[PDB]
From a paper:
We then investigated the stereospecificity of the interaction. DNA phosphorothioation replaces one nonbridging oxygen with sulfur and creates a chiral center at phosphorous. Conventional solid-phase synthesis of phosphorothioated oligonucleotides is not stereoselective and the two stereoisomers, Rp and Sp, can occur with roughly equal probability at each phosphorothioate linkage. To further explore this, we used NMR to investigate the interaction of SAMHD1 with the d(TG*TTCA) oligonucleotide containing a single phosphorothioate bond after the sole G nucleotide. This oligonucleotide was used because it could be readily separated into pure Rp and Sp diastereomers by reverse-phase chromatography. When SAMHD1 was titrated into the NMR sample of crude d(TG*TTCA), we observed that 1H NMR signals corresponding to the Rp diastereomer of the oligo gradually disappeared, whereas the signals of the Sp diastereomer were affected to a much lesser degree. Finally, we cocrystallized SAMHD1 with the crude d(TG*TTCA) oligonucleotide and resolved positions of the sulfur atoms in the crystal using anomalous scattering of sulfur in the monochromatic X-ray beam at a long wavelength (1.7712 Å). In the anomalous electron-density map, location of the sulfur atoms in the SAMHD1/ d(TG*TTCA) complex corresponded to the Rp stereoisomer. Furthermore, when the oligonucleotide was modeled without the phosphorothioate modification (e.g., oxygen modeled in place of sulfur), a significant positive difference map peak appeared at the Rp position to indicate the presence of the larger sulfur scatterer. In summary, the recognition of the GpsN modification by SAMHD1 is stereospecific for the Rp conformation of the phosphorothioate linkage.
Residue numbers in the entry:
A (entry chain D): 115 to 276, 284 to 303, 306 to 506, 546 to 582
B (entry chain A): 115 to 275, 284 to 506, 515 to 530, 542 to 583
The structure:
């Protein structure tokens, strides 16, 4: 049993079972993955990592579930349920890789387009690896938990299911599944909204303690849901204003997103040569460490500096891109487009995108002809739901003018909105 | 030109010459050195690094020197002066090593007791290395700086020295109290890290630095021009000293935080024969010798912690297992604290000898368990209105708590079983008596 002091939430009280889960290599790993990935290179206040965010989610999940239980004792929320919701909140982000959403949002689709990987699935596998490598099951049993049922409950809270599709808890407790990851209103967003604003200097006027006070479980369409009070909607709209401010000012920051693609580019040029030893001694690459949780345990933002400090000549190309970040010679912005309709470019097809741009035939024939390797195509998703930006690695005014020509034509070819 | 958004100071406008100093590998290296060292392992909000703090000192040094310049043209503060004071503020911490004060405060004294190293000497050497590796001298001249004098002025502002300085004459005495004031203890460096640390630690800081800068003036105090605060800022100054006191007592001197610093140092010492950092000309350096070559030093950051932790080399297993104790939270055990009240203080050159002294103390009641030097950690904790001069608004040209102990000594034990901890306490009590240090409290 411990208290951890956090600048966002103050004193965070942790049950002994939560402390045993936290003080493992699988959890402490999150200290080395920056929350905003490459955003730190734009926002110096944004040095925070997934670890303290995870503590905050575990704390918030516990407060909300405990407050529901005290106000409504008929829900039959047990102290076993509370701990399991806290574990899910603590562990929901175990699966993130180097630079957070850059890794599963961009790097893995570009290195292995045929593989389906999410950080959430990663959190389930890391959670299983954490449980199994630290003898956590006996400590769960020691504190009232029933491992087989509750471990499944925790995983379903993180990833969802595989008519009532959940096995960890029955349908009369369906509201427990809305706490950690939802409506789009869960305690995970509460923590990172507040924490990101604190680190970015952005005012945040959503008050989570007030939403907890007035949370109750009601029935809607013969289903139990967490609902807020009547006139408490204003606090709600303040949360959505903070969501949009954060998305507009930080998450979609043009230079932030460029730098992430540069880091990804360096990881790709390094993926053949970095070795990470996993289970039994087997060796893995950055792109295959997701296949072995012992190797994944050792895959963090440190990969950036392993490349940057390396001397192997084979890592020269990767190294040179990171060096371009330090000297601030970044890829150059070409323009932005959106797919019309409800069409979404799928992660599977990211790698094909630069080729399509280089295959466009700009009407006027430009002096400079560019190759698919000179183009970056950055697909920015939100949950306008998809934006597409193109950057060019060639800096000369000549290549940049040509790069815009390929980009403009490519949008027409796919009938995307025309660049402005 | 460029602008950087910072949560403490808001928009930080950066002159193009500062931008060119910042966008170098020597400066960006500060992104990989945590401000509080091992404190992050006790305070999850304290993920911040020396990079963002150095931007803030650069910013604050500029605001103060510009404010004095605009309100007191008689001081002849040039736009060249402002830039030099900004550069010094930006570059004053370039010399920190992995985990900041742990590195020069503890690791180098224990690894090379014969060397005299400070991060401030490091900052000068790294600043020089930054200048010459990135062609900064021409960019200086392009903006009106005279490199030979101005580089000297910048270095003296960082490291220190009748008038002993050569970068500026004595009539600009006051420029040397902006970035680093050892005499007074009130500089813009502390203003940033007070505000920044409180922000990441959730400690309220009532010191309002902008208001203090607004009312700062240069006045002659005993034949020297010195920066002075308006007399009505005494309440704001109280708030600064209360913040200083809170930070030292709750954070800088935290018991678990300091134990973790010694564990990391212990791991570096166990790894030091086996890590190699490639310096200039391809020559190989170690964690402890990377200070002798700024090319190797550029690549020595907190990364070394994970290099050790993720290693598979059987030669790094001992170092690696210490770092794993941190992750499992099986830390060294606190034994007690003492102070050398009324005695000569312990010096860096003697840190290495302390564990053998403790283990050699002869507790008069013989005990079962015998402990050796290697089971003991001896952690020496140094802390450093005395000379703060005021002025009144009517005569604007004529000048007008609970002191923390100078040196604290804590002892930790690596044996965790409880008979050994009892024995460690007996050795420690006897050692304090042997050295006429204060008797430890229960
Ligand atoms: Zn999260
Ligand atoms: Zn500093």
């Amino acid at each position: 049993g411990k208290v951890i002091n956090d600048p966002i939430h103050g004193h965070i009280e942790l049950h002994p079972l939560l402390v045993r889960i936290i003080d493992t290599p699988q959890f402490q790993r999150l200290r080395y993955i920056k929350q905003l990935g490459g955003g730190y290179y734009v926002f110096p206040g944004a040095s925070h990592n997934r670890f303290e965010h995870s503590l905050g989610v575990g704390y918030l999940a516990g407060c909300l579930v405990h407050a529901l239980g005290e106000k409504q004792p008929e829900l039959q929320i047990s102290e076993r349920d509370v701990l399991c919701v806290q574990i899910a909140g603590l562990c929901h982000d175990l699966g993130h890789g180097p630079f957070s959403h850059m890794f599963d949002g961009r790097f893995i689709p570009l290195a292995r387009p045929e593989v389906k990987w999410t950080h959430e699935q990663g959190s389930v596998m890391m959670f299983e690896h954490l449980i199994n490598s630290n003898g956590i099951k006996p400590v769960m049993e020691q504190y009232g938990l029933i491992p087989e049922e509750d471990i499944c409950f925790i995983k379903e809270q993180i990833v969802g299911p595989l008519l009532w599709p959940y096995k960890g808890r029955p349908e009369n407790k369906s509201f427990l599944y809305e706490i950690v990851s939802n409506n789009g209103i869960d305690v995970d967003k509460w923590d990172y909204f507040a924490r990101d604003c604190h680190h970015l200097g952005i005012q945040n006027n959503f008050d989570y303690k007030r939403f907890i006070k007035f949370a109750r479980v009601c029935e809607v369409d013969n289903e139990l849901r967490i609902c807020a009070r009547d006139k408490e909607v204003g606090n709600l709209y303040d949360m959505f204003h903070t969501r949009n401010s954060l998305h507009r000012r930080a998450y979609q920051h043009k230079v932030g997103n460029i730098i992430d693609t540069m880091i990804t580019d360096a990881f790709l040029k390094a993926d053949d040569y970095i070795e990470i030893t996993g289970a039994g001694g087997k060796k893995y690459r950055i792109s295959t460490a997701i296949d072995d949780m012992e190797a994944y345990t050792k895959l963090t933002d440190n990969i950036f500096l392993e490349i940057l400090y390396s001397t192997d000549p084979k890592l020269k190309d990767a190294r040179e891109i990171l060096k371009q970040i330090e000297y601030r010679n970044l890829f150059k912005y070409v323009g932005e487009t959106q797919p019309t309709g409800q069409i979404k470019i799928k992660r599977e097809d990211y790698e094909s995108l630069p080729k399509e741009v280089a295959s466009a035939k700009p009407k006027v024939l430009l002096d400079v002809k560019l190759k698919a390797e000179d183009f970056i195509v950055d697909v920015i998703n939100m949950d306008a739901e998809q934006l597409i930006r193109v950057y060019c690695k060639k800096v000369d005014r000549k290549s940049l003018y040509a790069a815009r020509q390929y980009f403009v034509q490519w949008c027409a070819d796919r009938n995307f909105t025309k660049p402005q």
